[PDB]
Every structure is written in structure tokens, then in C-alpha cells.
Amino acid sequence: NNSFITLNPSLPNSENSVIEAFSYKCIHCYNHHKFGTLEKLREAFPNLHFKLYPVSLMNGEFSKEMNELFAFAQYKDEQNGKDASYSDSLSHKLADVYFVSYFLNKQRNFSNLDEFYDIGLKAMNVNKNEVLNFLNTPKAKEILSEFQRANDIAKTYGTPAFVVNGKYQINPSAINSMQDLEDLVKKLSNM
């Protein structure tokens, strides 16, 4: 069958989930963001959680700081009843501003971190110190550790990469359509 590979070990804190490993510099990731792929999967599968895993080796010079901002967004979205499948989540808004920066606003280079960091902080209506205080917590360090698996996940087939229940990574060649992706997420989430 080869429609998926099994990750070993499983991704932590992944049960009942679809994880999308993505880059803000990837056209395919941008197209899935604009299309609302994760929102559509929530329409089909309201009991699954949807999470973004940024791929730091594809996210350029300020990739570590981008991972920090996504860890904060993931944290805060849990406090607010949202995940990455809601357009008004902090995770979706944060992905949106960086996709807009790169694909609409032609920004490739920043001469220092704070020009880059400020885009994310403005999208989430927070400041650098609020993010720094969150980063200095065991739970933030745990979320950032989880994102380290995104790099090898992305290398297998490219981005985006969809992972079901922390275990089953979908081969992009196995699907043509949104409904093909839904059907495979159903099969894998019921294994």
C-alpha cells in the first residue's frame, strides 16, 4: 500500500491529531493555507486536533525565533478553544503574516531579528517579553523539542507533510484531491 510511512517513535502529545509540517517559504504550504485544508479536515473530523509543526531548516535565518513564536501560538490557542484549523487561531494568523511577508510583500531578508520577530508579535498582539516569559517554562521547552522532529519529517517527501495520530505520515504521491486526503486521514486515524 505505501500511501503512508509509520514514524518510530510516535510523535509525543499527538493522539487524536493531524500535524502539518510546513515552511512559510513553501508554495505548496501557502496553497494549503489559502485553500483551508486543515479547516476542511476539521469539518470531516471534529474530534481531531490540528497542529502546525514549522520546519526550521526550511525557514531560513530566523527559524529558531519562528519556532518560538509558533510554540507561543500553540500554547495560547489551547487557552482560547482554538487550533490551527481555525482561521482566527494565533497559529493560523502567525502562519498567515509570514506567508504574506514572503509571497505578497517580497520580504526575503531582515538585517536583524526584531524586524522579523515584530511581524509575528504584531499578528498575535503580544510583545517580545511576554513570549520570553513563556519560553522560560518547561512546557514551552517541551513544545519546541516536539518541533525538532519536523526537519526529518519534511526531508522524506517534502512539504507540507501531514501526520495522523503522531504515527502515520501521508505520502503526498498517494493523494490527488482534498477528498483523497480526507479518506486517508479517516483510514489512518481508525488504525
Numbering used by the authors: 3 to 193
The paper states:
The bacterial proteins of the Dsb family catalyze the formation of disulfide bridges between cysteine residues that stabilize protein structures and ensure their proper functioning. The oxidative part of this network consists of two monomeric DsbAs (DsbA1 and DsbA2) related to EcDsbL, which cooperate with one DsbB. The solved structures of both CjDsbAs, especially the length and amino acid sequences of their L2 and L3 loops that are essential elements of the monomeric thiol oxidoreductases, were different from that of EcDsbA but similar, though not identical, to that of EcDsbL, which affected their functioning.
CjDsbA1 crystallized in the C2 and P212121 space group containing two monomers in the ASU for the monoclinic form and one molecule per ASU for the orthorhombic form, while CjDsbA2 crystallized in P3221 with a single chain in the ASU. In the orthorhombic CjDsbA1, the electron density map allowed for the building of the residue range 5–193. The superposition of monoclinic and orthorhombic forms of CjDsbA1 showed relatively small differences between them, which was confirmed by an RMSD value of 0.45 Å. The active site of CjDsbA1 was observed in the reduced form, while the CjDsbA2 formed a clear disulfide bond. This was due to differences in protein purification procedures. CjDsbA1 was purified under reducing conditions. It should be noted that the CjDsbA1 redox potential was the highest among the characterized DsbAs so far described; EcDsbL has a redox potential of −95 mV and N. meningitidis lipoprotein NmDsbA2 has a redox potential of −79 mV. We found that only CjDsbA1 restored E. coli ΔdsbA resistance to cadmium. In contrast, CjDsbA1 complemented a lack of EcDsbA in an EcDsbB-dependent manner. CjDsbA1 in E. coli was partially oxidized, probably due to sulfonic acid, and generated oligomeric forms (resolved by CjDsbB) that are active in disulfide generation.
